[PDB]
Design a protein around this ligand. Structure first.
Ligand SMILES: CCCCCCCCCC(=O)CC(=O)N[C@H]1CCOC1=O
Lengths: 234, 46, 57
């Protein structure tokens, strides 16, 4: 059912890139996948990837927002989703937490608690961009069953690659590889690439074949995500 | 000394399904291309 | 049975890497029609091999 793409993963950030891919194909812009070992409950030094704005992620950890965030509190005692309605922010700090989360563009969304077969505990949060809460919830109920299946697939394949530490060698791209991939990332079709760089269509298909193997992946959309994730393009 | 036809077969199994019922053309081809470059590169052993 | 269908793909890959570092220098240098050749060879070399294992049981 298309979810199989995750358990064929080279490692942590091909997997993290496929997760963002499916989450974007559903209609969510920003997502986060957190996971912890079986009975570790210190939310610092956890396995956390996704595409939350890096400024917000670094601030979330330095402020210890894990012990005030109403979503992760919920994941420790329930296995059902929690929606980011204003009702979940009750305390003085939760309001301050909420207003800062919206500044990072995380106004609407939901969090799916994760509980692995071996004791893992984590969260899978997805944020949606809408004009109002009513329009956001009509869409979130539109995709909830698909989303419900996704969180259990992301945790099975995620639990196997999360706590592995195989240091992946660095990846450097040529002068032309980065530019041809830069256009692929913003959805340019391969023929459209040929006419911008004044090369042949096979010239870019050839290049991307080198780009996909330099990252160890099997799809160019996934490789384009890992490039912006590592800051190598754009 | 590892089996890497897994990918190729799975990339082909798709590559023959992508047009089984005669959209995802390049995706199925992109899988094949580097699933073949992967084994192809490793097939220079010693 | 067929163990020569792999060095077909291996030479398709060695051709690929030769065009690769010949193109890594500057694309000026390489005949634009060898790009397509590296691609269709790799496709036909790997289509002929994957379709050897799918018949296996
Ligand atoms: C269940 C433990 C998982 C590991 C704990 C740290 C993971 C990161 C916590 C997190 O980001 C929760 C979250 O998604 N907060 C969103 C929700 C509302 O605004 C946010 O910043």
């Amino acid at each position: 059912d298309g979810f199989l793409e995750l358990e064929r993963s080279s490692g942590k950030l091909e997997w993290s890139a496929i997760l963002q891919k499916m989450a974007s194909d559903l209609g969510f812009s920003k997502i986060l996948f957190g996971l912890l070992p079986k009975d570790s409950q210190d939310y610092e030094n956890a396995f956390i990837v996704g595409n939350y704005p890096a400024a917000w992620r670094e601030h979330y950890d330095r402020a210890g927002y894990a012990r005030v965030d109403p979503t992760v509190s919920h994941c420790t005692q329930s296995v059902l989703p929690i929606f980011w309605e204003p009702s979940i922010y009750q305390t003085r700090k939760q309001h301050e937490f909420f207003e800062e989360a919206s500044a990072a563009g995380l106004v609407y969304g939901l969090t799916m608690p994760l509980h692995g077969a071996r004791g893992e505990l984590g969260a899978l949060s997805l944020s949606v961009e809408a004009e109002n809460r009513a329009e956001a919830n009509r869409f979130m109920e539109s995709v909830l069953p698909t989303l419900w299946m996704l969180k259990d697939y992301a945790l099975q394949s995620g639990a196997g690659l999360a706590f592995e530490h195989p240091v992946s060698k660095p990846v450097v791209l040529t002068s032309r590889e980065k530019e041809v991939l830069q256009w692929c990332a913003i959805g340019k079709t391969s023929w459209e690439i040929s006419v911008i760089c004044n090369c042949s269509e096979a010239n870019v298909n050839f290049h991307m074949g080198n780009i996909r193997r330099k990252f160890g992946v099997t799809s160019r959309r996934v490789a384009a995500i890992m490039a912006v994730n590592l800051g190598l393009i754009t | 000394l590892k089996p890497l036809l897994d990918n190729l077969r799975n990339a082909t199994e798709f590559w023959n399904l992508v047009k089984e019922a005669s959209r995802s053309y390049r995706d199925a081809l992109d899988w094949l291309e580097s699933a073949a470059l992967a084994l192809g590169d490793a097939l220079i052993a010693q």
